[PDB]
Symmetry: none
Subunit: 288 residues, 6 copies
């Protein structure tokens, strides 16, 4: 069984690798420190965001989409296989206007009658920056990658967002979807690198059930990452959010970097606080 | 291959969304706050009510049925797998009339001979809203789902109450029922999401026997949930009731949103008090 | 598949229901309050009576049988596994005559010679209200359920007393008898509910060995129960006795209703005192 | 399956039982309280002594042999299947003369040369009171019972001692020796009752391995008794010794009565202290 | 059927006993007290030496071999299953000459060229007392016992040291080696008791991983013994060594007699200190 | 069955033994003291290097390889599973040239253009002392052992570095990978001992979540080790690094020898400091 290369014959591969192996562009918002320990995200790179169920993997990664295609005018590609394009649209809108438009059947009625809908809608999607995959009808790997690709080549996006990488739906009949996740992650790291598009992906965590878990504290280690850690490899960076919803500061969320190929600088990035009012992830002043 | 819609083309689809789109719905009775945190029970959502043995599950749940099928007139399907329809209806009658009919032989005799029974009966069951699965003789999964599907689709029920999801009774010959519970959920959640009905399901908790427990106070945690954390994912809201029956305030019960997908707002909703006289779980005013 | 009845069509079923649908039946003797938090012993239920070793379990249950079988004329079946029929009968006689018949040779000599025995015998067992299970030799589960089953349906006993539910003796070759204590329960509960007889079962306690315990006071909690809490669920009313034989009032025994399905009314029911003369547990007035 | 006797037809059996169902004779030494909670041991009765491995089941029961055949001049029958008649003889001798003749190769040499051996030997076994079974070559049940019987009928002993009731050695080929112990215990309770000989037996405890065990504290409950508790029935009394050899008072031993058919009075008898000097079990002044 | 001997007829057999009957024998080196509590190692007795990983077992044991085979001239059989005979003999040489030969490349070279090696060698191995099983290539139970039996019976060894009883290597195809360990003991203990040889066996401890552990201080308990408590019964003496390698006094080691059949005297024997220079475990003077 | 050699007949075997029987080999670089408590890395041994995530494990092991492979001219095999060959090679180069080659685009651009890369490359890998395992794609146990096996016997490496022993990827269908981490070890240990190569394996830590931990200081104990302590036994020297990146001296890392078969010398070996410029772990002087 040979695949044991010697370090001298690695010469031409180290040269290739050494030329354009990513400097600074696109820096996450909501908390500096993520930036201090990563320096934003690179094209060709694969950002991995994870956390317990219902903790803000979705809220954080959507904020970046927002900021990115607003303040720093970038073409964000959205692919939320678990929600209607109108729903994700909704979050972006309420989010943009610092409000929780879903949690308010009065505010929804409000803006539609009083006309602020058309107002907000244009002011936001006005620059034709945001674009989205559309379905809820189980998407296949190649199928998906194609459209994800169309968002990068056809529409010309800088950043693509794939929410939840477990929803596989491909060539069924081959045991333990532990490889699907693996295979998919490679195609994703492939396409990402060869097009140079910033690719942000969200994956979930296995359920420990061997101690007190995630929704109650417990940091997440590289191991706890769902999917036979093929993604802990192909992904260049890994953001993790932890918060004890049953505690005193359920809105207090710690950001932890589990990997940053680029700066190799890991650990705790800092803290954030959910604003039940704006729905935003504001930077906090904490330390335990 | 095209199906990648653009922000703008969505403006009208998103408008048609933001109205006649109900985010609130069927508010829980017993404590404002279960509402302030969860915005009521959405249709197509799975409500998970849990607690220690004999602590309130059954009663809290039953009270919700009584209000929804009365004051807010909705068809309520009841599948109380551990008691006869006459018993559950007995409680329902007692409950509606703010009296504990079961616990009183005198009151029973009474209302029977003074003709009042028939009154309370019409006055409640009159608008044909209450419907119940009947047997006690162990029900199977597809068998029950079949009947439940009937209520939802056949009778047009809006809410289906299924008390006790540990009573399985299905294809025996496959180790640990841990897979039965999980596959059941996946079917209920599925049933729920596709019919758009409101599904309130009760579950019990694994015996911690590693410290002081549930009927003695002691917060329930998402790990405490009997059934290998499948439901901890498939259900949308987890309502847990905690109380220390062996104390000064046995009837004081704490409400904890163990999870609420739709809002993400978890934590201590509030408190309620058991009224040994009416049998209702009235909202309280307390702080520990 | 219609077996889903609507409330209305149950009118008649519910009338025939509340009338002659006893919810107060067989009150306990020697301590009102047990009767207050439980409204007695309903047929079809499972009454659990536990305590530290040699602290009330036995006597209290033996007294209830004695009262129920006389003054109240019910038929009582005794399943005393750790003793012979003449052993338990000996106790009964003496117990009825407020005399420690066993701990005294002088008296056994007398009554037998002076003829008072035949008197006492006829006076206690005269009304054929007492029947027992006879053997002492390790009884198997199905082997048992069947005899108790006989007592009920064959002999017509309204009450059955199973002393010690740790003496399992069934299908050997299946790890941890923890399973045995659970399966047996499930068979008894079914037995009781279906047959409608009153089942008063005795079980012991887990030796905590983590604090000062049982023999020295210490309240018994539901967790403390032997056999992984299957019974904690299958039984409908758990009565627990506590006392400190190594304290000041070694005769003052506390009576705790650890659980009572029917009423939900839990907590300390009251107190009782041991009278070394009569061998009884006399009614007491106290508050610590 | 019938063996369900009625309490009226039990008349002639209760009469038999009531005549000579044992007052006071032979009271254990080393600690009063055992006596206060049992009143010595009766002829026909079966004393059961148990404790962890190496705690004094053997030292206690040998002290009684001593006292009994010395101060109260009774014919003690000894059957120590795990030690040479000369070894058990040794303990009795050193014991009698308040010394640990085994633990002293100097004291052994001493008395043999200086002539105190013949002295002690006569002064003790002088009254031809002690008698012993002889072998180490595995003894069968009937085989054993016969000799044990010969000690009661042939030699005319008041008290018989059978050390360690696990060493069965009988009709091999019948699964789980759980019955051997059971069967044997019956023959033993039989012969004991029908001859009227005091029978003291020593049995060991199962190994809990579910918490901190025996040699480190932990009282022994009736359950922990090795052998499918057939012996917790046939034996009339059950003495148990507990001591934490890894503690501060490894010589401090608590006596606990797990049963006393006669006085039914159980619990903690009191305490004792090993005298590393005399090897005796002296009464102590303690309370925890 | 007669075999019931009488006290008196025994006088001569008992005399012949009390002399040329050795109760002391082969005292442990390293701390008087292992002796004061156990009176040395009797022949036909099973010595159990245990401790945390790399804490001293091997060394304590090895030192016993060196003294017994030297100063008290006895034939010592060594079966060190985890090291070559040259290694064990290397230590033995180093040890005898109060130097750590292994840990010194200079000293090794030395004694080799200055001819001293040959001296130390004769001076030690000379009286042909040291014998060792040889291989490293996994030994089977009857295979090893066979060889061990050889040393005892063939070579006439008095003491057999068998290091590490977890290295089984026998009839594989029967779940959990827990039965291998137990059946091995039963064979060694048997081998021991019948040949009258002294058997010192080493075992390791189950990983507690439930608190602070063994190499950090933390008393070993009879439950901590790896191998389902078979050895906790079959061996006659259990010598355990405890030390906290991560402290101020890493080399201070505590001696605990976990059990000593022959005497019953258990507890803390004493302390010893590891001398990084001589490599010996010298007796200390300490008190915590 | 003779395979029992006598000490004497081993004279010659023991001479050829102590001579050219290295006990000091391959000392560690950058912190004398590791070398003091371990006398380096003997061939055939298994060196365990662990720590909190991102706290020294990687760098320290990467530095040892770098030194061993140059200044000392040994052959080193790298089995870095979480990185590509050009990735780890990139690190090495930069590491050798005390420059953060990865975290800096400007420099990769330079050296490649200014030709300094070819220089650096030849200077580091010139002597063909470096070889790697190539894949990234989940390697199976037997699949691996074989390649490492190749490096040793085929390529002649004196040292092999296996980064991350949690990336098992072997025979799936056997509960708890706890078994996997143990079996793999056993195969590596065997591999090492038999082949004679130096095996330096990296493994991570159990997240205590019971106190303040790893990322914040806290000493690592042996128990803290991932994979139920099979390694804690199979490995011959465990090196643990501790540090507080959320404290005062985030660069001061402590080096603890958790275990060292060979010498037994355990405890804190010393300290080191992280230099953000060089990316190295410089030798340090300290005492807290």
């Amino acid at each position: 069984p040979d695949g044991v290369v010697s370090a001298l014959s690695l010469r031409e591969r180290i040269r290739e690798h050494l030329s354009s192996e990513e400097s600074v562009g696109l820096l996450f918002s909501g908390c500096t420190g993520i930036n201090d320990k990563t320096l934003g995200a690179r094209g060709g790179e694969v950002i991995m965001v994870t956390s317990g169920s219902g903790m803000g993997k979705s809220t954080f990664v959507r904020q970046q989409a927002l900021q990115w295609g607003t303040a720093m005018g970038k073409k964000v590609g959205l692919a939320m296989l678990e929600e209607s394009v109108e729903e994700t649209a909704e979050d972006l809108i309420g989010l943009h206007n610092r409000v929780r438009l879903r949690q308010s059947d009065s505010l929804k009625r409000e803006i539609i009658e009083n006309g602020k809908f058309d107002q907000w809608f244009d002011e936001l999607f006005g620059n034709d920056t945001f674009h989205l995959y559309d379905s809820f009808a189980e998407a296949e790997t190649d199928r998906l990658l194609a459209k994800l690709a169309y968002m990068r080549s056809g529409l010309g996006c800088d950043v693509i967002i794939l929410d939840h990488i477990s929803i596989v739906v491909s060539a069924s009949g081959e045991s333990d979807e532990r490889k699907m996740i693996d295979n998919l992650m490679t195609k994703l790291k492939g396409f990402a690198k060869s097009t140079g598009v910033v690719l942000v992906v969200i994956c979930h965590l296995k359920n420990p059930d061997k101690g007190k878990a995630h929704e109650e504290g417990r940091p997440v280690s590289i191991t706890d990452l769902r999917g036979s850690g093929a993604l802990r490899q192909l992904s260049d960076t890994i953001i993790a959010l932890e918060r004890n919803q049953q505690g005193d500061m359920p809105n207090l969320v710690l950001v932890r970097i589990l990997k940053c190929r680029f700066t190799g600088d890991t650990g705790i990035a800092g803290y954030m606080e959910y604003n039940k009012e704006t729905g935003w992830l504001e930077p906090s002043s904490y330390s335990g």
